[PDB]
Design a binder for this molecule. Structure first.
Ligand code: ZFI
Ligand code: ZFI
Lengths: 235, 179
């Protein structure tokens, strides 16, 4: 993650991220809607950050320091490149919608009035199809990756040296190899909870209540399809 | 510090996300309670033992029976959650959550936790339940359920008032240490 985004999403809520004087001239329901919207983006930043820890820190690190067999690193981090492309493009769109909503002269005061459209384009068409195939592959290879990491740790002392080394920083406390895999697997199931609570406070504009209602159904259809496509692979 | 893993399971509105947020922050969120929980690694010190406790939630996976079991690998303790203001959530514990938790996590300690114990003295809760010929889950009903499902123990708490929240997580650590 880059410092600019880290600071823009450092606060524990939208009400705390914007200036209090900006918050002051806003209806309570708007504040409630913005808080859940801010959280959807904040967790997407952390999701993309988790994927960068897997690709740059763990996956690349093993390739450039260790002597592992071919196909072993891919078995540990399946679809991490394709997942990173999906979520970094999504985050880019979320951060741009927020930047466009900034008040002139400010870098923290914003109100995102239209989210549903962004969510519909993301969870429908070829972009939904690519997430469905990527999450069915990831989750079917999830168990195998956990067993492959435990096999490498309980047999290679050069692997334990590498793991102890890269995960030593305090910032990676909750971001070990196995934690990263479950964090990615659970991500998809967070969206319906987020979208339903945004929808809950988006009845003001009927165009927006409909867009978010459509997007909620699109996400649930994607989740049901990924769930059906999963069949655990054993090594 | 030994690393142990905790997973909280239970129906949708049992307050499991609220319980994990309140413990991982130490206080009740005074401005905004997050909709979701990612993960947290707790630095718990129970009975002189320093343990690193990974906290995980299953919220949002109750409808996806093939995605859900993926939170179970290497679990050291299961927090089986139900809401005291919802006798129906307690009814699903022995026939929905228990068979699954014992299949994917054999020999793993299960602590049955009754969330929202504050609502036992809430007038709106007692009136809403009475209309559907019901009342809040009694302490003896919860204890009887833990006895029946073979739970390691039974605990109650209230994430709203933080009462009993620390004792649950210190006890979950003790349960995860027993080999
Ligand atoms: C865009 C901007 O400057 N917003 C702001 C910042 C601080 C206090 C008040 C306001 S206002 C009057 O809502 O635009
Ligand atoms: C989840 C999945 O694999 N979906 C898939 C795969 C191949 C073609 C089309 C699709 S879908 C049903 O459009 O998501």
């Amino acid at each position: 993650s880059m410092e600019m985004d880290e600071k823009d999403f450092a606060a524990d809520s939208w009400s705390l991220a914007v200036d209090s004087s900006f918050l002051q001239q806003h209806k309570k329901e708007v504040m409630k809607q913005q808080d859940v919207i801010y959280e959807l983006i904040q967790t997407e930043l952390h999701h993309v950050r988790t994927l960068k820890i897997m690709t740059r820190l763990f996956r690349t690190g093993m390739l450039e320091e260790l002597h592992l067999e071919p196909g072993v690193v891919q078995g540990l981090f399946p679809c991490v490149d394709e997942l990173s492309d999906i979520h970094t493009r999504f985050l880019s769109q979320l951060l741009e919608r927020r930047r466009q909503a900034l008040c002139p002269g400010s870098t923290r005061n914003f109100v995102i009035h239209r989210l549903g459209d962004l969510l519909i384009s993301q969870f429908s068409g070829p972009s939904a199809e690519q997430m469905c195939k990527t999450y069915s592959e990831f989750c079917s290879r999830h168990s195998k990756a956990l067993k492959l990491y435990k096999e490498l740790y309980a047999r290679d002392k050069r692997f334990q040296q590498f793991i102890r080394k890269v995960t030593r920083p305090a910032v990676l406390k909750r971001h070990g190899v196995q934690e990263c895999i479950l964090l990615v697997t659970q991500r998809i199931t967070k969206y319906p909870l987020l979208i339903s609570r945004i929808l809950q406070h988006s009845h003001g504009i009927e165009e927006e209540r409909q867009d978010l209602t459509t997007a909620l159904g699109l996400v649930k259809e994607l989740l049901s399809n990924v769930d059906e496509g999963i069949y655990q692979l054993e090594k | 510090a030994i690393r142990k893993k905790l997973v909280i399971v239970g129906d949708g509105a049992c307050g499991k996300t609220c319980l994990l947020i309140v413990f991982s922050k130490d206080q009740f969120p005074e401005v905004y309670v997050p909709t979701v929980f990612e993960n947290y690694v707790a630095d718990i010190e129970v009975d002189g033992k320093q343990v690193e406790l990974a906290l995980w939630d299953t919220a949002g996976q109750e409808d996806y029976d093939r995605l859900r079991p993926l939170s179970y690998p290497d679990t050291d303790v299961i927090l089986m959650c139900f809401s005291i203001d919802s006798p129906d959530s307690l009814e699903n514990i022995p026939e929905k959550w228990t068979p699954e938790v014992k299949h994917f996590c054999p020999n793993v300690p299960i602590i049955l936790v009754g969330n929202k114990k504050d609502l036992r003295n809430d007038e709106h809760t007692r009136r809403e339940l009475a209309k559907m010929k019901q009342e809040p889950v009694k302490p003896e009903e919860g204890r009887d359920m833990a006895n029946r499902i073979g739970a390691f123990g039974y605990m109650e708490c209230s994430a709203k008032t933080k009462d009993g929240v620390r004792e649950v997580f210190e006890m979950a650590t003790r349960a995860a240490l027993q080999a």
